[PDB]
Every structure is written in C-alpha cells, then in structure tokens.
Write a protein that binds this ligand. Structure first.
Ligand code: HEM
Ligand SMILES: C[C@H](CCC(=O)NCCC[N+](C)(C)CCCS(=O)(=O)[O-])[C@H]1CC[C@H]2[C@@H]3[C@H](O)C[C@@H]4C[C@H](O)CC[C@]4(C)[C@H]3C[C@H](O)[C@]12C
Ligand SMILES: O=C(c1cc2cc(F)ccc2[nH]1)N1C[C@@H](CCl)c2c1ccc1occc21
Length: 467
C-alpha cells in the first residue's frame, strides 16, 4: 500500500533528538503534519506512532489481534525475570490465559462482597480503612511540622489497599520494608517509558548507567519480596479459605503454562496497582491546591448530595457529577500515562491505507488525544466544567474521549478498580478536610516524562478540618 510518512531523520540515530526529554510533546506536534500513522527511527529501529481517537480505535479494537503483541525491548527483559505478563513478547494463548487469571483474581478480592461486612465490598472496606488512617496521619503532621509532602503518605494508604488485595496484609505509615520498595526507588516509569534510548542504542546498556543499574536492583528487590510473600502463603495455604489473589494463584498451580508465569502475576497487579493510583491521587491533590475554586465546588456538591452525617459510599459515585468531571479532567489534563505500553504487530497488516510489517514497534499516543485542539476547547487549561452539560450532568459523549486506560485486547484490566479507588479516597477526604498550599512557595506542575508521569516533590501542603 504505502509506507507511513515521517520527518527526516539521521541515518544512525534517527529522530532520537527530536523526541528529546518529552517524546509525547514532540510526537504530538509531529502528528499535526504527518497524520495519525507516522514512522520514526530510534537509532536504526523503525517505530510507528499512532495518534487520533478514531485511528487508535481502528487499530487496537477493530484490528486488536493485529496489534496485541509486545516488542522485544531490552528494558522489558529485566522485569519479572523476563516473564512478565504485561511486558513479555508472549502474546499467544499463553498470555491470554494469564490475563484471564488476573481478571478473575481481581474481581474476587476487589469488587466482590466482603464476608465480614454485609454492606460494602472488599475495595470499599479497604479504602475506608486506609482513608481514616490517612486523615489521622495528616492531623498528626499538622500538630508538629505544620506541613507535609502528600506523596510520602498517599503511597502508603494506596499501597495498603492493593497490598491487602494481593497479600492480605497492611503496613504502618513508617515502615522501612515498604517505603524502600515503593518510594525513592521507582524509576520504573523513567526507564520503561516509551522511547527509552537504551532499548534502541545497544551501547548505552554497557556504559555507566546509574538509572539502569538502579532499575535492575529495583526488580531484583521486588522479585525477592514476591518469593518471600509467596513462600509464606504456601506455608499456611488452606484449600477453601482463599485469603487474597496470591492464594487463588497458588490454588491454580495445584489444579493443573509454568508455575512461575502463574505466581508472578501478582507482581504485575501490585506494580500497576500502587504506581498508577498513587500518581493519579497525587496529581488530583496538586490541582485542588492550585485551583481552590474547584475544590470549593467539589465540597459544595458533597454537602448537598451527602451532607456530613455519613461517609461517602460507592453508591454515591453516580450522583456526584462534578467529582467525576474533576477526576476526568485530572486524567485528561495531566495524561499521566502519556503512552500505552509499546505494542507490536503480530502479522503484516494494513491501517488507514498504510502497510505495517510483522514485528514493527508501535507507540500509542494517548497524550495527543487528550490535548487534540480539534476535540477540546482550551486543552492546556484545567477546566472540569468542560464535561458538564447545561443541566449539570456528565456529558457521556465527551467523557469517553478521555483515553488513559488504553483500548482493545491489551486494555487495562484494573480500570474499574482504579476509578472506584480514586473516587473514594477523594470523596472521603474532601468531605472532612481541606487541602491548601501557602503563598510564596513554588509548586512545579510540570510533568516529568515516564510510563507514569510524576511531578516535582512539594513539601508545603497543608490540611485543615471543615466546620
Ligand atoms: C488510574 C489508574 C490506571 C491507569 C491510568 C492505567 C492505565 C493502563 C494502561 C495505559 C495500560 C496499558 C494499555 C495498553 O498497553 O494498551 C495498563 C495496563 C495494565 N494495567 Fe492499568 N492503569 C491503572 C490502574 C491499574 C490498576 C489499579 C491495576 C490492577 C490493580 C492495573 C493493572 C494493569 C495491568 C496488569 C496491565 C497490563 C495489561 C496487559 O499487559 O495486557 N492498572 N494500564
Ligand atoms: C513450616 C512448615 C510448613 C510446611 C508445610 O506444612 N507445608 C504444607 C504445604 C503443602 N500444601 C500446600 C500442599 C498443603 C496444602 C494443604 S490443603 O489443605 O490445601 O490440602 C510446618 C510443617 C510442620 C510445622 C511444625 C509442626 O506443626 C509442629 C509445630 C506446630 C505448632 O503449631 C508450633 C509450630 C510447629 C513447630 C510447626 C512449625 C511450622 O508450621 C511447620 C514446620
Ligand atoms: O507492571 C507494572 C506496571 C506499571 C504501570 C503503569 C501504567 F500507567 C500502566 C501499566 C503499568 N504496569 N509494574 C510497575 C513496577 C512497580 Cl513500580 C513493576 C511492575 C511489574 C513487575 C515488577 O517487578 C519489580 C517491579 C515491577
């Protein structure tokens, strides 16, 4: 048919300099000229970059089986001993079977009803517990220091939820086992983010690379923690009393695809679990602090729809259209997952009249959709009201153009869990407390590129109870 178009690139390094430190911004300007299917080169490796709401739906959904593979990148082979469900090049029926195990394991210990509490489910019970511990920890910080860095304590509250779902345990707010793994050891996004030169320039792996060495250690540390957590569950495993997702995977090793590819699925769940949800909640607090106008509106809605006599529940999610418009605009404006995990073609295929051979690396630019000047009014501006119709309800036609959970056969499997976890944490907190940042302190809202885009650490947040 045709080869996908693209700008001129150096014969040796390709367009690696055009990408720069923000490949999502460069490839969004590039799509304005070369279209929804364009081709670049990182070093000598060709890469196809998909942009556009309809073209990405055409490729990942309607032709999903043509794009459901992962490329064979170097950085991916360092994840979970090279056998990760999400990052391994395996995309046949072996992957499809592991994905179905994860989906069923999640539904059982997140959305399913809790035997302990008749009213709520597992997720609502865990989030309610951790949101109270979080509010108490922040009250203690206002008793002394008078300020705090939220990420340090949100990451614990969010980890205790996904950790209770995967290992049936929780940890205190000041635990060295936990913070070592999750905090200040998470350059996973920085190393795995699409366009990493080390994947396409083979010499950068062997040179002095401080980030790549800390990455090998982070994974080796996590894989050891998994072995400790699974061996301890195997030592007390009772068939019939399934405590968490780990037990249902142990149960599935005895009921019949190696045992390692079954057990290390919790590493993908635990990993994606705390990294994305913590990033999302962290960004939310930044926007509430920089836009006190919209924090006041979220609270005026909570006071009308729920009052202050009872904690918000999952049932209230559909009766709070402004809270959902805020969370949607946090996902759209930040786009803290600017690219999906890189895809790969499983066969010679055709897309919008362009030929893509088998094995071609494929990037999916979610950031471009969420800031397309043709789909949005003031994309650079943070304006939650853009999702509200004239009668104050969520515009469903427009809200389903916020692409951040992926699409197709490789779509996020914890999407529904993240939307409820994010809603509850924000709803329970903003009902009780009000966050702020004093004047005259810098608050760098600039995203830092990575698989999940984080922000500069802010240590000046404050919190007060409400009347
Ligand atoms: C706001 C929160 C989250 C966002 C924005 C998000 C986004 C994404 C994206 C963009 C992908 C890749 C899509 C693709 O490759 O086409 C993905 C995959 C995945 N997500 Fe999520 N995610 C979130 C939360 C979660 C949670 C809470 C879990 C589990 C507890 C989870 C588990 C996974 C897994 C296992 C994959 C790999 C799927 C595969 O490789 O087929 N994610 N997510
Ligand atoms: C640490 C090992 C665990 C080895 C084990 O038991 N491995 C079973 C796993 C095999 N499966 C997964 C197939 C079982 C599935 C069961 S299913 O129901 O699924 O069929 C278990 C097995 C024997 C246990 C000791 C004795 O008790 C004596 C004593 C009991 C008291 O309390 C105080 C503790 C003490 C010292 C115990 C310590 C420890 O606790 C031991 C060494
Ligand atoms: O799978 C993921 C993941 C993050 C993420 C973010 C997204 F926005 C969308 C999809 C995603 N997936 N992670 C992250 C990391 C824990 Cl920080 C980690 C794994 C997996 C196996 C691992 O072994 C040792 C560490 C480790």
């Amino acid at each position: 048919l045709k080869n996908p178009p693209g700008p001129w690139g150096w014969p040796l390094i390709g367009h690696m300099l055009t990408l720069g430190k923000n490949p999502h911004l460069a490839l969004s300007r590039m799509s304005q000229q070369y279209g929804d299917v364009l081709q670049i080169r990182i070093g000598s490796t060709p890469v196809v970059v998909l942009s556009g709401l309809d073209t990405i739906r055409q490729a990942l959904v309607r032709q999903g089986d043509d794009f459901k593979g992962r490329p064979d990148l170097y950085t991916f082979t360092l994840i979970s001993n090279g056998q990760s469900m999400s990052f391994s090049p395996d995309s046949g029926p072996v992957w499809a079977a592991r994905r179905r195990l994860a989906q069923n394991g999640l539904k059982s210990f997140s959305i399913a009803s809790d035997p302990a509490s008749s009213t709520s489910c597992y997720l609502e019970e865990h989030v309610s517990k951790e949101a109270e511990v979080l509010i108490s920890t922040l009250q203690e910080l206002m008793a002394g220091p008078g300020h705090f860095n939220p990420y340090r304590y949100v990451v614990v509250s969010v980890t205790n939820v996904i950790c209770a779902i995967c290992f049936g345990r929780r940890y205190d707010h000041n635990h060295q086992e936990l913070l070592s793994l999750v905090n200040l050891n998470n350059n996973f996004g920085e190393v795995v983010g699409s366009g990493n030169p080390a994947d396409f320039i083979p010499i950068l792996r062997y040179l002095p690379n401080p980030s790549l060495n800390a990455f090998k250690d982070l994974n080796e540390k996590f894989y050891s923690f998994m072995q400790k957590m699974v061996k301890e569950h195997y030592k007390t495993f009772e068939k019939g009393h399934i405590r968490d997702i780990t037990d249902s995977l142990i149960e599935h090793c005895q009921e019949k695809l190696s045992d390692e590819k079954i057990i290390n699925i919790v590493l993908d769940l635990f990993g994606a679990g705390f990294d994305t949800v913590t990033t999302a909640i962290s960004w939310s607090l930044m926007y509430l602090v920089m836009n006190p106008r919209v924090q006041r509106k979220i609270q005026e809605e909570l006071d009308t729809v729920i009052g202050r006599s009872r904690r918000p529940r999952l049932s209230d999610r559909s009766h709070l259209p402004y809270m959902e418009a805020f969370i949607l605009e946090t996902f759209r404006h930040s786009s803290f997952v600017p690219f999906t995990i890189p895809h790969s073609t499983t066969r010679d295929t055709s897309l919008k009249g362009f030929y893509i051979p088998k094995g071609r690396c494929v990037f999916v630019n979610q950031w471009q959709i969420n800031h397309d000047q043709k789909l949005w009014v003031n994309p650079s501006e943070f304006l939650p009201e853009r999702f509200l119709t004239p009668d104050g309800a969520i515009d469903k036609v427009l809200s389903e153009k916020v692409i951040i959970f992926g699409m197709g056969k490789r779509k996020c499997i914890g999407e529904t869990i993240a939307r409820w976890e994010v809603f509850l944490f924000l709803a329970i907190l903003l009902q009780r407390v009000e966050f702020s940042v004093p004047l005259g302190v810098k608050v760098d809202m600039t995203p830092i590129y990575g698989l999940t885009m984080k922000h500069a650490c802010c240590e000046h947040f404050q919190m007060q109870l409400r009347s």
